Amino acid sequence: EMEKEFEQIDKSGSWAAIYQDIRHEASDFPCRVAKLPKNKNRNRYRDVSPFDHSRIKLHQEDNDYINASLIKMEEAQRSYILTQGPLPNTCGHFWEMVWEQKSRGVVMLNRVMEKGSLKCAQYWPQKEEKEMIFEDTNLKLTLISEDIKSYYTVRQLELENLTTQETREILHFHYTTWPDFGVPESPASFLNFLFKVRESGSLSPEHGPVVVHCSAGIGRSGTFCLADTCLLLMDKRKDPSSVDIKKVLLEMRKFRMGLIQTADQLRFSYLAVIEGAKFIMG
Ligand SMILES: COC(=O)c1c(O)cccc1OCCCCNC(=O)[C@H](Cc1ccc(OCC(=O)O)c(O)c1)NC(C)=O
């Protein structure tokens, strides 16, 4: 399978090379809207922008920009919205996107503070009695319940459109033990987290695209979506060994830049997929 290739790359210690090999072949499209001066304060990293063709547009006549990309995998029949961790002034935009895109789940793969620094705003209420209201996009957010586990937390939230008093349940999956720029020692916990997301229905067709993010929404977020899509493919195809992870990644990079930030994450993606495969086949 892809495991065969794994050893090959591992025994010859050529990951770094194979990873750079993908960076060179990766797609490159314009990000003009993201670069407008008008949107300077809406971007966390100047080097991490959404392409124009695949960017998510907010549904407002004001400024429709938000650093977020719709990754649409045709064959896998799955779509994901990869975005940056919300900034102090984009939290309203963030929840507007979730509402407008009909998303059921939000997957956060980073902690608010990492390496002693702020990597994202506290964009969701931490206490039931303290609901948040985003005045700029006229939305109300409320913590309904919370389940704290060893390496991840699942929060049930309620998002309400104050314009129409319409309400929806949003599931928040918080992977809290993923070292920044690194990868877990064992993919098991990662995979276990992925399946929890799958079991909630948030990745299903009857719902809008799941919202995935870390700090930049490319490294850890990339690893999450690459593994999910790969497993889904082996699951659907008549040949579970026909799934080319490198092909899947590149196909994803057509929609957002920098997916998979280090050769290590690439190696981890291979592991996560290979291991997750053991389940996909009985
Ligand atoms: C490796 O670079 C690429 O693949 C790449 C490319 O090929 C083409 C265009 C852009 C690319 O990627 C561009 C990213 C370059 C790396 N730059 C940085 O460290 C940060 C942004 C960043 C990136 C990944 C992160 O974690 C992700 C995680 O692990 O969860 C993160 O927290 C923050 N920028 C600055 C200057 O503060």
Q: Residues for the chain: how many in total?
A: 282
3-state secondary structure of 38: helix
What's the gap between Cα 117 and its chain centre?
Answer: 21
* Resolution for the entry shown, Å: 2.3
Q: Which of 250, 261, 269 best tests ligand 1's pocket when mutated (most atoms within 8 Å of CB)?
A: 261
Other residues' Cβ atoms within 10 Å of the Cβ of residue 257: 21
Q: What experiment produced this structure?
A: X-ray
CA–CA dist 212, 85 (Å, integer): 9
Helix ranges, 104-244 (H):
187-199, 220-236
Q: Ligand 1 centre from 279 Cα, in Å?
A: 32
Contact residues for 245 (Cβ-Cβ < 8 A; gap 6+):
2, 226, 230, 269, 270, 273
- Single-letter residue type at 245: I
Contact residues for 33 (Cβ-Cβ < 8 A; gap 6+):
39, 52, 55, 65
How far, CA to CA in Å, does 113 sit from each of 93, 147, 183, 266?
Answer: 21, 20, 17, 24
Pairing of strands 78-83, 68-73: antiparallel
Q: Ligand 1 centre from 219 Cα, in Å?
A: 7
| CATH code for position 49 | 3.90.190.10
Contact residues for 226 (Cβ-Cβ < 8 A; gap 6+):
245, 248, 249, 252, 259, 260, 269, 273
Does residue 214 carry a catalytic annotation? Answer: yes
Among the options 91, 214, 225, 230, which is catalytic? 214
Name the DSSP letter for residue 166. E
Q: How many domains does the chain have?
A: 1
CA–CA dist 15, 19 (Å, integer): 6
Q: Ligand 1 centre from 43 Cα, in Å?
A: 13
Instruction: Decide if 94 contacts 83 (C-beta within 8 A).
Output: yes
Partner residues linked to 72 by β-bridges: 79
CA–CA dist 105, 172 (Å, integer): 6
What residue has token string 């399978």?
1
3-state secondary structure of 190: helix
Q: Is the CB of 257 under 6 A from ligand 1?
A: yes
Closest CA to 94 of 157, 126, 139: 139
Residues of each annotated binding site: 180, 214-220, 261
Tokens of 190: 């990662």
166-175 β-sheet, strand order: 68-73, 78-83, 210-213, 105-108, 166-175, 152-161, 139-148, 132-134
